[PDB]
Amino acid sequence: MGPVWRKHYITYRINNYTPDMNREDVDYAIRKAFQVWSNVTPLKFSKINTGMADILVVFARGAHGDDHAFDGKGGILAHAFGPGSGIGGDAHFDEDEFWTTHSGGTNLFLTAVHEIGHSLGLGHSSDPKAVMFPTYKYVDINTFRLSADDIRGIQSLYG
Numbered sequence: 001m002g003p004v005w006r007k008h009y010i011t012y013r014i015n016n017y018t019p020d021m022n023r024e025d026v027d028y029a030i031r032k033a034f035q036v037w038s039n040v041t042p043l044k045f046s047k048i049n050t051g052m053a054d055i056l057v058v059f060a061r062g063a064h065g066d067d068h069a070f071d072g073k074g075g076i077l078a079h080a081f082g083p084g085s086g087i088g089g090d091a092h093f094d095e096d097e098f099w100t101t102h103s104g105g106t107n108l109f110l111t112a113v114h115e116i117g118h119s120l121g122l123g124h125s126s127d128p129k130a131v132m133f134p135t136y137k138y139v140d141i142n143t144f145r146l147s148a149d150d151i152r153g154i155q156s157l158y159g
């Protein structure tokens, strides 16, 4: 076992917003990506705007203060730290991508589902249909479902 949150109530804060999307569409995409994971575990997520959030969502570019710089458009789309205090849990999105609500550019909701997986403690899947597969794939958002391998992974950590 990798690190896991020791509690089932987890807060998140959106540190800043990409100018690529409307603020409301970023909030929705993030809220829906947490909901994917809450639907198969005992976890609950609440958004705060001040105070001490466990998972900070950041948009940043290039070398942005942790050891893992971003690489411009393409390649690394985002990354996240596993459960822990401070930077633990935090999910950072490369502003050099073009974030969207749809199939164009890079879909924020799907990328956030994957990154939130890492923020909760998952590694990668070798199942091509699992959201935790190492490479991005757009899949129809309205019918999106976690694969059984994703659900096995997250239920092996939280129950």
Ligand SMILES: NC(=O)[C@H](CCC(=O)O)NC(=O)c1ccc(-c2cc(-c3ccccc3)cs2)cc1
Pocket (backbone or CB within 6 Å): 075, 076, 077, 078, 079, 080, 110, 111, 114, 115, 118, 128, 129, 130, 131, 132, 133, 134, 135, 136, 137, 138, 139
């Ligand atoms: N390519 C990279 O270097 C980074 C490394 C950081 C990480 O692995 O989080 N990876 C990504 O940027 C990244 C990888 C996968 C995904 C996504 C995979 C899927 C997906 C959906 C259905 C089936 C398979 C994958 C949607 S987003 C998003 C970003």
Ligand SMILES: [Ca+2]
Pocket (backbone or CB within 6 Å): 053, 054, 055, 056, 084, 085, 086, 087, 088, 089, 090
């Ligand atoms: Ca944190």
Ligand SMILES: [Ca+2]
Pocket (backbone or CB within 6 Å): 070, 071, 072, 073, 074, 075, 076, 077, 094, 096, 097
């Ligand atoms: Ca990039």
Ligand SMILES: [Ca+2]
Pocket (backbone or CB within 6 Å): 018, 020, 094, 095, 096, 097, 098, 099
């Ligand atoms: Ca951008």
Ligand SMILES: [Zn+2]
Pocket (backbone or CB within 6 Å): 064, 066, 068, 079, 092
């Ligand atoms: Zn980072």
Ligand SMILES: [Zn+2]
Pocket (backbone or CB within 6 Å): 114, 118, 124, 132, 133, 134
């Ligand atoms: Zn990943």
